[PDB]
Design an enzyme around this catalytic site. Structure first.
Site, short mmCIF file in Angstrom:
data_model
loop_
_atom_site.label_atom_id
_atom_site.label_comp_id
_atom_site.label_asym_id
_atom_site.label_seq_id
_atom_site.Cartn_x
_atom_site.Cartn_y
_atom_site.Cartn_z
N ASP A 238 -58.57 -79.18 -49.35
CA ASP A 238 -59.25 -80.44 -49.17
C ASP A 238 -60.73 -80.25 -48.86
O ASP A 238 -61.21 -79.12 -48.70
CB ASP A 238 -58.60 -81.23 -48.06
CG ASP A 238 -59.17 -82.62 -47.95
OD1 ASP A 238 -59.10 -83.35 -48.96
OD2 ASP A 238 -59.70 -82.96 -46.88
N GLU B 231 -35.45 -83.57 -52.68
CA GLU B 231 -35.87 -84.59 -51.76
C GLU B 231 -37.20 -85.21 -52.17
O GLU B 231 -38.06 -84.54 -52.74
CB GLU B 231 -36.00 -83.98 -50.38
CG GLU B 231 -36.41 -84.96 -49.34
CD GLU B 231 -37.00 -84.26 -48.15
OE1 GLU B 231 -37.27 -84.93 -47.13
OE2 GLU B 231 -37.19 -83.03 -48.26
N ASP C 37 -52.81 -76.50 -50.90
CA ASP C 37 -53.66 -77.67 -50.66
C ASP C 37 -55.07 -77.28 -50.23
O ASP C 37 -55.26 -76.54 -49.26
CB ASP C 37 -53.03 -78.58 -49.58
CG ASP C 37 -53.89 -79.79 -49.24
OD1 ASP C 37 -55.01 -79.60 -48.71
OD2 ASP C 37 -53.44 -80.93 -49.49
#
Ligand SMILES: [Zn+2]
EC number: 2.7.7.102
Lengths: 105, 389, 123, 234
Positions: free
Chosen positions: B111, B44, B109
Site C-alpha cells: 500500500d 471462504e 499487499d
C-alpha cells in the site's frame, strides 16, 4: 495414574509428604479439557485459545461458589450456626467437583 | 474521471453485480477446473453488507449460488479467504478443532501508507501520477522474484482500489505452503527495517545477494525519473536534511555546500555520488544504494501473506470511497499502468445504460477482463500440461 | 386462581403402571396445627419429548441410497406423521422445528442442527 | 562408520533373546554415556574426541565388519539398540532431552567421519530427493552462490560439493537470505546441509519419543522390562 517406586527403608530425619490439591479436577480446568474442547473419535489438549465448554463452565461456577462461601466465612459478627453451615456447603462443592472426573472415566 | 458519488453506490452495486461482474471467470478461477473434491465448495469468502454489518464464513455449491446470493446481498466489500477441510457455511456442524484452514493463495499487499516518509507529493492515504512509480517498482521487484527466485509462475496483481497493489500467487504447489515458509518468503523479499521511527532504515553489508543486487538494478531504471525530477528529493535543506540523515555525519558539511551551490536535485545527487563514493574508498556501506533502497524498495505487511487464512480484498470488487474497480494488472505493460484511468463502477454502469451476455465488453471494464482470461488460460495450461502429462 | 407452597424431598414414577406421572413427596405447613405435615402432590401429563435428526438427503433405506431430493423439516414431519406414527400407534402429538447443540459419543452427528421436536402422551 | 549412518526410522520387526535384548541396551547406553563424557571433557572438533569416540563405537561393536546382504553385524546392533533404548528414555522430559542430546551428538560424529563424497551418496538415497550439480552449472553460477553465502571469506567456492534442494526445505536459510535461490531451488554446501539434517533429525526424534510414551502402558506390565524402564542408571 503414575506410581513411583517406594524407597523401601527406614528414615532417621523428617519426611515432608507434599501433595496436590484436587488433581484431575483442576487439570480439567488448566488444559480446558471437555466434551466440546477436545478432539476425539489419547488425543491432544485443544489450544489455550479455545473458550471454555459446557464441562469447564460448570466446574467454573463450581469454584465461583466456593469463592463466595470461603469469603462469607471470613465475615465476623456472624451466626455461629452459619459457621457450621458454610463449612459443610464447602466440603460439598468440593466433593462434587473431584468426582466430576470419576464421572468421565 | 467524474467525481465518484458514494450515495449512488447502493444503486450502482445491484446493477454491477447484476450485469457487469465476471462471475464466469471468478468461478472458473477459484474452481481451478474441478480437479479436486470441493476446492470452491470449501473456499471462504467475506462480505461487508449494509449498515457496515460484517458477515464471514460464507460458502457455496456452484456458480449459480454465487450469483443469487451476491445479487441478493449486493456487498460493499468482498474478500477471498482460503479453502478449508469442511464447508465454511457449515462450521457450526463440525466439532471445534477439525475445521481448519488447509490451503489459500500466497498474497502480497503493498500500500501507499507504507512510504509516508519517502513521498513529497501526496499525503499518506492519497496518490497521483508523480509517486505512482512506487507501485511499478514494487511490481517488477517482487513479481521479478516470485518468478525468478522461487519459480512461482501464475502471479496475478490487481488494483487495490486507491493506493496500493495486491499479488495472487496461484501456483498449485503454493496454495498448500505452510505458513512458516510463507513467512520465509516475505523475509527474503523484505529490506526496509522500519523501527519505531528510525532515520536510517536500510543497512547493507559488503556482500550483496542477487535479489538485493537485481532489485537495486531495477530501482536504477526509475531512480532519477521519479526521485529527482518527479519528487525532487533534494531541492530544499528541509528535504536534503532528510537524506543526509542516512549518511555518516562527517560527510554532511561537504555535501551541504555541494547542494547549496547546485540548482536542482539531479546535480545534487551526482554530488553525493561523488562525496560518498570518495567516502567509500578511504573507509564500504554502499551509501549510494542504501538510500535508493529506503526510498524505492517495497514495504510489505507480514500479517498479510503469513496467514494462510487471511481475508484479502477480492479481485474486481468495488472501492466505496473512489469507486474504482479493483483491476488485475497487465505485466506486459507495468510502467504504463494507469490508476487514474481505471474504470469507475459509476462510469461502467453509465456505459451499459448508454446502450450469452458479454456487455462487460461493451464497457471499459472489458480490457481488464481479458488480462484475467490470459491468466485463466496460463493456468489451464498448467493443469493440462502438468496433469495430462 | 388458587395455589399452595410445599418443600419436597423424594419422588417416584411408575412407568410400567402410571407413565406420564410422578409423585413428589415433601412437607406443607398448616396454621391449624402449628407444625408441618407429610404431603404428597401428583404431577400428571408429562409428555415424552423426542428429537429427530433430519438427513442431508432423502434415502431409500431398503437399498441404501439417495433419491436426489434434499431434505427439509416438512420432509421429516410427514415421515413420522404418516409412516412412523401409525406403525407405532400415535394419534395426537406436538411437532416443532428447533435448533439444538450436541457433543457426545455418537459418530456422524452435528454439534448443532435443526431437529424435529416431537412430544406425545406418556401413555 | 560405513552405510552405518542411519535415520532410526521404521521399527525393527526381528526378535531377540532377552539376553540380546538386555545386552543391546546396556551396551547401547554405555556408548551414549560415553558420547556424554567426551562432550564434557573435550570439544566436538578434537582428535582425542573423534578418536576415543570411534574407539568405543568400536569396542561396543557398533561400526565394523561386513556380511551377506541381510545380517550386517554392527548395522543391526545400532538399529535395535537405539529403538529399544527409546523405551527407557521416553518418560522424563529430562531424559527425552538428554537422549535426543546424545543421540544427535552421535549422528554428528558419524558424519564428521565421512568425506564430502560418501555423505553425498547417503543423501541421494536416504529420505528421497536431493541433487548434485555438475561443475558446469557449478561454476556458471559460482559467483552468485558466493554472494548469497554468509560472511564466507574470499571468493573461493572450493571443491566443497554443492547441492540443489527445494527452496521449501531450506526455509531456515533462505529466510535470512543465506543461500542462492533460482526457479524454486536453493544451493547450499555441506556444513549447512548437515545442520539441517541434524535439525530435522531432532524434531523427528522428539516427535517419536512422544509417540513412544503414549503407547508405553502396553508393556510396563511385562516383568522382564522393569530393569530397563526403571533401572538404567539407579
Ligand atoms: Zn503523488
Amino acid at each position: 495414574g503414575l506410581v513411583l517406586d517406594p524407597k523401601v527403608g527406614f528414615y532417621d530425619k523428617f519426611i515432608l509428604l507434599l501433595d496436590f490439591n484436587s488433581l484431575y479436577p483442576s487439570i480439567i480446568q488448566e488444559f480446558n479439557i471437555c466434551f466440546t474442547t477436545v478432539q476425539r473419535v489419547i488425543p491432544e489438549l485443544p489450544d489455550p485459545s479455545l473458550e471454555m465448554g459446557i464441562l469447564p463452565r460448570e466446574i467454573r461456577k463450581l469454584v465461583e461458589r466456593r469463592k463466595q462461601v470461603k469469603q462469607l466465612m471470613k465475615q465476623q459478627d456472624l451466626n455461629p450456626d452459619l459457621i457450621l453451615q458454610y463449612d459443610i456447603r464447602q466440603k460439598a462443592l468440593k466433593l462434587t467437583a473431584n468426582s466430576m472426573y470419576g464421572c468421565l472415566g | 474521471m467524474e467525481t465518484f458519488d458514494p450515495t449512488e453506490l447502493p444503486e450502482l452495486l445491484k446493477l454491477y453485480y447484476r450485469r457487469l461482474f465476471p462471475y464466469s471467470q471468478y468461478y472458473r478461477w477459484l474452481n481451478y477446473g474441478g480437479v479436486i473434491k470441493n476446492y470452491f465448495q470449501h473456499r471462504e469468502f467475506s462480505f461487508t453488507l449494509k449498515d457496515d454489518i460484517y458477515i464471514r464464513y460464507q460458502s457455496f455449491n456452484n456458480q449459480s449460488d454465487l450469483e443469487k446470493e451476491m445479487q441478493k446481498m449486493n456487498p460493499y466489500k468482498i474478500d477471498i479467504g482460503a479453502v478449508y477441510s469442511h464447508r465454511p457455511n457449515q462450521h457450526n456442524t463440525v466439532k471445534l478443532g477439525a475445521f481448519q484452514a488447509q490451503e489459500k493463495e500466497l498474497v502480497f499487499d503493498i500500500d501507499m501508507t507504507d512510504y509516508d516518509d519517502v513521498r513529497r507529493c501526496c499525503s499518506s492515504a492519497d496518490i497521483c501520477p508523480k509517486c505512482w512509480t512506487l507501485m511499478t517498482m514494487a511490481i517488477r521487484i517482487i513479481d521479478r522474484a516470485l518468478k525468478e527466485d522461487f519459480g512461482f509462475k501464475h502471479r496475478l496483481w490487481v488494483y487495490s482500489g486507491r493506493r496500493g497493489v495486491h499479488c495472487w500467487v496461484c501456483d498449485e504447489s503454493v496454495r498448500k505452503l505452510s505458513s512458516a515458509v510463507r513467512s520465509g518468503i516475505v523475509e527474503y523479499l523484505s529490506l526496509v527495517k522500519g523501527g519505531q521511527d528510525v532515520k536510517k532504515k536500510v543497512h547493507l553489508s559488503e556482500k550483496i545477494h542477487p535479489f538485493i543486487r537485481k532489485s537495486i538494478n531495477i530501482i536504477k531504471k526509475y531512480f532519477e525519473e521519479y526521485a529527482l525530477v518527479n519528487q525532487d528529493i533534494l531541492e530544499n535543506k528541509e528535504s536534503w536534511d532528510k537524506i543526509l540523515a542516512l549518511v555518516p555525519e562527517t560527510i554532511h558539511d561537504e555535501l551541504q555546500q555541494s547542494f547549496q551551490k547546485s540548482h536542482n536535485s539531479l546535480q545534487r545527487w551526482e554530488h553525493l555520488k561523488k562525496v560518498a563514493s570518495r567516502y567509500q574508498n578511504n573507509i564500504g556501506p554502499w551509501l549510494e544504494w542504501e538510500i535508493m533502497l529506503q526510498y524505492c524498495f517495497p514495504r510489505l505487511d507480514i500479517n498479510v501473506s503469513k496467514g494462510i487464512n487471511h481475508l484479502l480484498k477480492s479481485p474486481f470488487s468495488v472501492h466505496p470511497k473512489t469507486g474504482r474497480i479493483s483491476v488485475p494488472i497487465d505485466l506486459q505493460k507495468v510502467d504504463q499502468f494507469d490508476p487514474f484511468t481505471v474504470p469507475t463502477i459509476s462510469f461502467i454502469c453509465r456505459e451499459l445504460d448508454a446502450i450469452r451476455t458479454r456487455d462487460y465488453k461493451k464497457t471499459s471494464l472489458a480490457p481488464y477482463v481479458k488480462v484475467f482470461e490470459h491468466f485463466l488460460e496460463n493456468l489451464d495450461k498448467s493443469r493440462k500440461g502438468e496433469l495430462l502429462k | 386462581e388458587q395455589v399452595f407452597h410445599f418443600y419436597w424431598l423424594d419422588a417416584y414414577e411408575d412407568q410400567y403402571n402410571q407413565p406420564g406421572v410422578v409423585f413428589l413427596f415433601g412437607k406443607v405447613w398448616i396454621e391449624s396445627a402449628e407444625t408441618h405435615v407429610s404431603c404428597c402432590v401428583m404431577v400428571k401429563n408429562i409428555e415424552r419429548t423426542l428429537y429427530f435428526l433430519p438427513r442431508e438427503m432423502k434415502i431409500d433405506l431398503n437399498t441404501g441410497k439417495e433419491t436426489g431430493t434434499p431434505i427439509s423439516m416438512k420432509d421429516v414431519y410427514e415421515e413420522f406423521d404418516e409412516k412412523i406414527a401409525t406403525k407405532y400407534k400415535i394419534m395426537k402429538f406436538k411437532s416443532k422445528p428447533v435448533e439444538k447443540n450436541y457433543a457426545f459419543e455418537i459418530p456422524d452427528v452435528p454439534e448443532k442442527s435443526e431437529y424435529l421436536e416431537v412430544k406425545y402422551s406418556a401413555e | 562408520y560405513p552405510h552405518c549412518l542411519q535415520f532410526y526410522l521404521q521399527p525393527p520387526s526381528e526378535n531377540i533373546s532377552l539376553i540380546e535384548f538386555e545386552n543391546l541396551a546396556i551396551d547401547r547406553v554405555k556408548l551414549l554415556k560415553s558420547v556424554e563424557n567426551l562432550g564434557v571433557s573435550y570439544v566436538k572438533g578434537t582428535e582425542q574426541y573423534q578418536s576415543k569416540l570411534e574407539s568405543e563405537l568400536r569396542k561396543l561393536k557398533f561400526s565394523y565388519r561386513e556380511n551377506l546382504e541381510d545380517e550386517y553385524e554392527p548395522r543391526r546392533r545400532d538399529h535395535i539398540s537405539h529403538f529399544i533404548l527409546r523405551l527407557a528414555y521416553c518418560q522424563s522430559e529430562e531424559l527425552r532431552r538428554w537422549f535426543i542430546q546424545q543421540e544427535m551428538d552421535l549422528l554428528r560424529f558419524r558424519f564428521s567421519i565421512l568425506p564430502k563424497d560418501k555423505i553425498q551418496d547417503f543423501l541421494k538415497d536416504s529420505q528421497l530427493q536431493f541433487e548434485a550439480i555438475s561443475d558446469e552449472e557449478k561454476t556458471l553460477r559460482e559467483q552468485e552462490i558466493v554472494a548469497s553465502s554468509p560472511s564466507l571469506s574470499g571468493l573461493k567456492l572450493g571443491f566443497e560439493s554443492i547441492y540443489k534442494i527445494p527452496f521449501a526445505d531450506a526455509l531456515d536459510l533462505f529466510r535470512g537470505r543465506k543461500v542462492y535461490l533460482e526457479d524454486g531451488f536453493a544451493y547450499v554446501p555441506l556444513k549447512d546441509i548437515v545442520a539441517i539434517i541434524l535439525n530435522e533429525f531432532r524434531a523427528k526424534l522428539s516427535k517419536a519419543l512422544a509417540l513412544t510414551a503414549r503407547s508405553l502402558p502396553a508393556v510396563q506390565s511385562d516383568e522382564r522390562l522393569q530393569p530397563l524402564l526403571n533401572h538404567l542408571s539407579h
